[PDB]
Write an enzyme that holds these catalytic residues in place. Structure first.
Site, short mmCIF file in Angstrom:
data_model
loop_
_atom_site.label_atom_id
_atom_site.label_comp_id
_atom_site.label_asym_id
_atom_site.label_seq_id
_atom_site.Cartn_x
_atom_site.Cartn_y
_atom_site.Cartn_z
N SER A 48 0.80 -1.23 0.00
CA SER A 48 0.00 0.00 0.00
C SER A 48 0.83 1.28 0.00
O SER A 48 0.25 2.37 -0.17
CB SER A 48 -0.95 0.01 1.19
OG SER A 48 -2.04 -0.90 0.98
N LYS A 51 0.26 3.60 -2.79
CA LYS A 51 -0.84 4.56 -2.87
C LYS A 51 -0.33 6.00 -3.12
O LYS A 51 -1.10 6.84 -3.55
CB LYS A 51 -1.73 4.49 -1.60
CG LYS A 51 -2.62 3.21 -1.59
CD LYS A 51 -3.67 3.18 -0.45
CE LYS A 51 -4.61 1.96 -0.56
NZ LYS A 51 -3.80 0.68 -0.63
N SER A 96 -5.86 2.84 4.16
CA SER A 96 -5.34 1.90 3.17
C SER A 96 -6.46 1.15 2.46
O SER A 96 -6.43 -0.08 2.33
CB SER A 96 -4.36 0.93 3.82
OG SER A 96 -3.27 1.65 4.34
O1 LIG Z 1 -1.19 -0.53 5.20
C1 LIG Z 1 -1.44 -1.16 6.29
O2 LIG Z 1 -0.91 -0.98 7.40
C2 LIG Z 1 -2.43 -2.27 6.29
C3 LIG Z 1 -3.04 -2.59 7.51
C4 LIG Z 1 -3.97 -3.67 7.48
O3 LIG Z 1 -4.63 -4.05 8.64
C5 LIG Z 1 -4.25 -4.38 6.30
C6 LIG Z 1 -3.62 -4.02 5.08
C7 LIG Z 1 -3.83 -4.77 3.84
C8 LIG Z 1 -3.70 -4.16 2.59
C9 LIG Z 1 -3.84 -4.92 1.43
C10 LIG Z 1 -4.07 -6.29 1.45
C11 LIG Z 1 -4.22 -7.03 0.15
O4 LIG Z 1 -3.26 -7.75 -0.21
O5 LIG Z 1 -5.30 -6.87 -0.45
C12 LIG Z 1 -4.16 -6.90 2.69
O6 LIG Z 1 -4.39 -8.25 2.77
C13 LIG Z 1 -5.75 -8.63 2.99
C14 LIG Z 1 -6.10 -8.66 4.47
C15 LIG Z 1 -5.16 -8.93 5.47
C16 LIG Z 1 -5.51 -8.94 6.83
C17 LIG Z 1 -6.82 -8.69 7.23
C18 LIG Z 1 -7.77 -8.42 6.24
C19 LIG Z 1 -7.42 -8.39 4.89
C20 LIG Z 1 -4.03 -6.14 3.84
C21 LIG Z 1 -2.71 -2.98 5.14
#
Ligand SMILES: O=C(O)c1cc(O)cc(-c2ccc(C(=O)O)c(OCc3ccccc3)c2)c1
EC number: 3.5.2.6
Length: 243
Positions: A48, A51, A96
């Site tokens: 991310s 972004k 994010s």
């Molecule tokens: O930028 C941050 O800190 C952040 C913080 C977070 O809590 C979650 C994410 C995040 C961003 C993109 C993806 C992806 O690959 O689509 C992702 O994985 C799916 C996913 C993982 C865990 C729980 C629910 C869903 C996670 C980023």
């Protein structure tokens, strides 16, 4: 002597049962510092943190009109609660919100996106993979060191987009401020391709200097995500950059 290693920061990773790299760049002295020169030049998925360029490109092309335009929730309920609501550019970046930025990527399209990343000299400039997820599981890669180089152009309005675009993205990056310092930064979490890593890239504004930074660390679980900022702040206090 523009780069210098300092292994004392490893104590902070160790205290937290962690591995990673922290890269600092003093803008006034035009000098860099890091606890692991090799990891600092190894390229990872941006996740991310992508972004930042994605925002710049959506804004210059008019896909996004400004930081107030509202992107409606599509009604699909997803695992992250804060994603299940309407967002603008400020809140999408803060939480994010991936599906908002996948929409931007689809509107931009493959040819415009690749052309813009060449202009930015962003990472390996590789967009192979899916148009709306290549920064999470495609061919793009970027190092902590390469993040700083990109962030410095942004600070000075040097990137190949309008100054208005770069000023809006630096506003949306705002994370924390008080009488002592301002932090503009972007978190990232790369889980789709091994190794799972957490990111934090940005800079610290002081009265008379700015310290750019870029860190990543191994991150097997989501429970340790706060360590991204904790370990960075501990390095910052050690160097007397923040109190
Ligand atoms: O930028 C941050 O800190 C952040 C913080 C977070 O809590 C979650 C994410 C995040 C961003 C993109 C993806 C992806 O690959 O689509 C992702 O994985 C799916 C996913 C993982 C865990 C729980 C629910 C869903 C996670 C980023």
């Amino acid at each position: 002597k523009e780069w210098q290693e300092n292994k004392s920061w490893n104590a902070h990773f160790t205290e937290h049962k962690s591995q990673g790299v922290v890269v600092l760049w003093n803008e006034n002295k035009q000098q860099g510092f890091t606890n692991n020169l090799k990891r600092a030049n190894q390229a990872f998925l941006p996740a991310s943190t992508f972004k930042i360029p994605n925002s710049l490109i959506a804004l210059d092309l008019g896909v996004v009109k400004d930081e107030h335009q509202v992107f409606k929730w599509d009604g699909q309920t997803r695992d992250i609660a804060t994603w299940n609501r309407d967002h603008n550019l400020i809140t999408a970046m803060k939480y994010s919100v991936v599906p908002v930025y996948q929409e931007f990527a689809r509107q931009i399209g493959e040819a415009r996106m690749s052309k813009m990343l060449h202009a930015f000299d962003y990472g390996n400039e590789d967009i192979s993979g899916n148009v709306d997820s290549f920064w999470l599981d495609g061919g793009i890669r970027i190092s902590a060191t390469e993040q700083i180089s990109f962030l410095r152009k942004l600070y000075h309005n040097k990137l190949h987009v309008s100054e208005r675009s770069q000023r809006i993205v630096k506003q949306a990056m705002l994370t924390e401020a008080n009488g002592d310092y301002i932090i503009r930064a972007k978190t990232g979490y790369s889980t789709r391709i091994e190794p799972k890593i957490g990111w934090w890239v940005g800079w610290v504004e002081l009265d008379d200097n700015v310290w750019f930074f870029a860190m990543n660390m191994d991150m097997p679980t989501s429970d340790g995500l706060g360590l991204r900022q904790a370990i960075t702040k501990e390095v910052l206090k050690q160097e007397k950059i923040i109190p």
